[PDB]
Nucleic acid binder design. Structure first.
Ligand SMILES: [K+]
Ligand SMILES: [K+]
Ligand SMILES: [K+]
Ligand SMILES: [K+]
Ligand SMILES: [K+]
Ligand SMILES: [K+]
Ligand SMILES: [K+]
Ligand SMILES: [Mg+2]
Ligand SMILES: [Mg+2]
Ligand SMILES: [Mg+2]
Ligand SMILES: [Mg+2]
Ligand SMILES: [Mg+2]
Ligand SMILES: [Mg+2]
Ligand SMILES: [Mg+2]
Ligand SMILES: [Mg+2]
Ligand SMILES: [Mg+2]
Ligand SMILES: [Mg+2]
Ligand SMILES: [Mg+2]
Ligand SMILES: [Mg+2]
Ligand SMILES: [Mg+2]
Ligand SMILES: [Mg+2]
Lengths: 116, 221, 245
RNA sequence: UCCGACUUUGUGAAUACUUAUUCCGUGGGUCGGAAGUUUUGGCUCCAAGGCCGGCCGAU
RNA sequence: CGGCCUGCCAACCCUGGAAACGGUUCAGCCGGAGGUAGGGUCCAGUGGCCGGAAGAGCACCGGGUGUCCGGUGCGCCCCCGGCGGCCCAUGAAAAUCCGGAGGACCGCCGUUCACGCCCGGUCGUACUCAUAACCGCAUCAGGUCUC
RNA sequence: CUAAGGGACGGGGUAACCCCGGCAGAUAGCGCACGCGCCCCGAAAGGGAAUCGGGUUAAGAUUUCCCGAGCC
């Protein structure tokens, strides 16, 4: 005992291997792409962003962060987002500014969706 | 090789830093270790009444190893052996066994019934009031008894832990002479001395430092 | 009535000491084997000011006796100590100002400061600026020593108690007139909430035993029993005499 | 708050003891018995060496 | 933001050796514990030139022209530097970052270098800040911290 | 991130609500088997990774959008 100080010794601890699962339902992704992308904005200010900055405006879930948004637009419309700017509006909803990469034309995407 | 050389270090008060030492006696132990060590010291310092001090006198090592090697002959059957004996009887569809008796209530009953031929008492029954009266009862009933070290040793014989008392009522005819020689030695101690034993207190031993500093004061006279 | 000001200080609410800019407790290094049997050299690195303390403190660095580490100490500085000076602590330390010695090693008449009351106390006596204790006599049978405290009282201490050689630095501080309420305000700003004292005769009876009256006067003897309850024990407490001799 | 009784509260000599209790110190770091570093404001740890993982060096 | 230059006031280095003392500030003060002098190192800048960058912005003329040269200061605001004074007053801490002492260990393996590749979450962000967006029952001569 | 300060494991008190943090309790872990070992909250004026110029709206951006140029 070269130390005059006693320390608690290191003891083995096993991991949890339960005899039954506490949850048996698999657990389903309730924040899927349809919850993330609710609907696009069609205001006059929102329509200007389409042809001026290659940008689509969406109303998004409050629980959706920027990473889920760009993954959602890719799985919904097969387009690539260059960047996503988000805000929470004074009405309490979340609004996303989705700028598409060059070689994606938001006006063509806007025509396919139906907002134009 | 001339390159090799000694590089001694002088370990003074303001000298080289000392190497790792044992430092065992200066270790600050957990509270559980400190309480059990102080409990041993307190029992040494406090005057121990004779009825408790008598458990300090234990069976001799030579006698104890003789008695236990004989107590091993009369071990009760283990759980598997009892199961096997049940099956063997069931195949026919026995004999009176000679085994050690144990359990404080059962041993106490045998002694008052005058059937105990030898009583073995453990020296470390933690509630000491369980067996503190036992040497008096065995001596009153004229029963040879001894105090041996280890309740866990007594427990091992009966396939338990901490038997705390063992009783022999019967011995085999192959062991009558050996059991009798054992019996007289256990009677010479523990039974014929019980009367003189009932007056010895023996519990006032001080610490080594306290002893050394009284010897000096005694030598200064 | 209401709780008097003397009683309210024990709650320690606004009467706690002002210690936000203090440099740490000033005291000897913990007694150990090297000090008990030999000497240990440290070097003074700084002489610093401690708010609320009249005496300067000395920062001293030792080498740890068994760990590869530095050991930094801070105690009250004796007068004459200086930076870059070697100080020695222990049984075999030389009788020089700034050294820390057991009382057994200090002859009769020596001037000492920061004197321990119990062995390993790290210094309890004669710590204020300009103060010191005097070694009066030694008893080898009981292993005790007699010292004279700054108040004049004789005291019996174990001969193994440690003291620093010399007197505390910063003496003469209270000979200078303060001259100003503002100088007193700054002095107590770094000590405690105590300075501006209102006379008890200037109060109402609800606040003080001296309060009230159509003239400012105590109206009863200002000497008070030693066993008076708090709130009643004001004025001169358990005084054997009064007046100016 | 002072003061007395009981309790905590024990042991042995013609006042002593120490383990209860109380207080102080330490990162519980050289305690008891025996045997055999004053240097100048510098650095100092994790052993060289010897002998068979082991012992001395480090009673 | 990047490169080169410059290099204040202090601080530091090398040579040398000072009374008939000298150097020096508005004030101080400094020198055989090495001054004056000579020659250098570093430090900071919100300093200079180039890149950025004239392609911008601005002012004119109907695409075009120009965007230049000096002077001054007990001036005002901000920041910095370096001295002096004052205290029975001596005027936070931690995260974070950098440097160093040592050298166990290690060779086709080391590399705090340049260039090159990818990524960067959540919440706030409008407006008033007051003789009308705050409190005083009000669109109240009051009150309410700043640049 | 820490400041004055606040809460709080164990322990102590308390009929319980609750009141006490230095009273030290095997302190619950950290590097490379081996080695070491003296909780959180609390500042949009304290400390602190890194951005600039120009343009743009009815309403934004006194550095978030656009252009260009950097940085961590
Ligand atoms: K009251
Ligand atoms: K006050
Ligand atoms: K007064
Ligand atoms: K009065
Ligand atoms: K904004
Ligand atoms: K108003
Ligand atoms: K902050
Ligand atoms: Mg945002
Ligand atoms: Mg009045
Ligand atoms: Mg009154
Ligand atoms: Mg020059
Ligand atoms: Mg340019
Ligand atoms: Mg132009
Ligand atoms: Mg201004
Ligand atoms: Mg190195
Ligand atoms: Mg923290
Ligand atoms: Mg605090
Ligand atoms: Mg609790
Ligand atoms: Mg915080
Ligand atoms: Mg800040
Ligand atoms: Mg605006």
């Amino acid at each position: 005992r070269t130390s005059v100080t006693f320390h608690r010794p290191k003891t083995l601890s096993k991991a949890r291997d339960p005899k039954y699962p506490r949850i048996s339902t698999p657990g389903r992704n309730k924040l899927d792409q349809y919850q993330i992308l609710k609907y696009p904005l069609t205001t006059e200010s929102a329509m200007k962003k389409i042809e001026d900055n290659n940008t689509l405006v969406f109303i998004v879930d409050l629980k959706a962060d920027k990473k889920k948004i760009k993954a959602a637009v890719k799985k919904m419309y097969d387009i690539q987002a260059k960047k996503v700017n988000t805000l929470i509006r004074p009405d309490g909803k979340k609004k996303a500014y989705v700028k598409l990469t060059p070689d994606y034309d938001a006006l063509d995407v806007a025509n396919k969706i139906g907002i134009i | 090789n001339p390159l090799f050389e000694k590089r001694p270090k002088q370990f003074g008060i303001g000298g080289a830093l000392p190497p790792k030492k044992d430092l065992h006696r200066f270790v600050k132990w957990p509270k559980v270790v400190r309480i059990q060590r102080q409990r041993r010291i307190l029992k040494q310092r406090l005057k121990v009444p004779p009825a408790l001090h008598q458990f300090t006198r234990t069976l001799d090592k030579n006698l104890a190893t003789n008695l236990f090697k004989m107590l091993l002959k009369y071990r009760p059957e283990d759980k598997a052996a009892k199961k096997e004996r049940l099956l063997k009887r069931a195949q026919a569809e026995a004999k009176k066994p000679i085994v050690v008796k144990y359990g404080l209530n059962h041993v106490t009953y045998l002694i008052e019934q005058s059937k105990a031929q030898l009583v073995v008492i453990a020296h470390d029954v933690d509630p000491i009031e369980l067996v503190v009266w036992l040497p008096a009862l065995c001596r009153k009933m004229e029963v040879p008894y001894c105090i041996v070290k280890g309740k866990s040793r007594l427990g091992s014989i009966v396939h338990k832990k901490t038997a705390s008392v063992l009783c022999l009522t019967t011995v085999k005819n192959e062991d009558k002479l050996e059991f009798s020689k054992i019996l007289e030695a256990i009677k010479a101690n523990f039974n014929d001395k019980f009367d003189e034993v009932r007056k010895k207190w023996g519990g006032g031993v001080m610490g080594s430092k306290s002893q050394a500093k009284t010897k000096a004061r005694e030598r200064l006279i | 009535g209401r709780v008097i000001r003397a009683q309210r200080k024990g709650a320690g609410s606004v009467f706690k000491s002002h210690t936000h800019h203090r440099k740490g407790p000033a005291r000897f290094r913990s007694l150990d084997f090297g000090e008990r049997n030999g000497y240990l050299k440290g070097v003074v690195t700084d002489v610093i000011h401690d708010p609320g303390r009249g005496a300067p403190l000395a920062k001293v660095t030792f080498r740890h006796p068994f760990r590869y580490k530095h050991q930094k100490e801070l105690f009250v500085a004796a007068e004459g100590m200086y930076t870059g000076q070697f100080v020695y602590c222990g049984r075999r330390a030389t009788l020089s100002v700034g050294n820390v010695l057991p009382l057994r090693s200090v002859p009769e008449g020596g001037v000492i400061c920061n004197v321990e009351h119990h062995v390993g106390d790290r210094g309890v006596f004669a710590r204020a600026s300009g103060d010191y204790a005097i070694v009066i006599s030694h008893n080898p049978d009981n292993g005790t020593s007699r010292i004279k405290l700054p108040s004049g009282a004789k005291k019996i201490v174990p001969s193994s108690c440690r003291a620093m050689i010399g007197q505390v630095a910063g003496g003469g501080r209270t000979e200078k007139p303060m001259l100003k309420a503002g100088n007193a305000y700054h002095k107590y700003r770094v000590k405690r909430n105590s300075w501006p004292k209102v006379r008890g005769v200037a109060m109402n009876p609800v606040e003080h035993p001296h309060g009230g009256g159509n003239h400012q006067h105590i109206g009863h003897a200002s000497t008070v029993r030693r066993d008076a309850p708090p709130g009643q024990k004001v004025g001169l407490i358990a005084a054997r005499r009064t007046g100016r001799l």
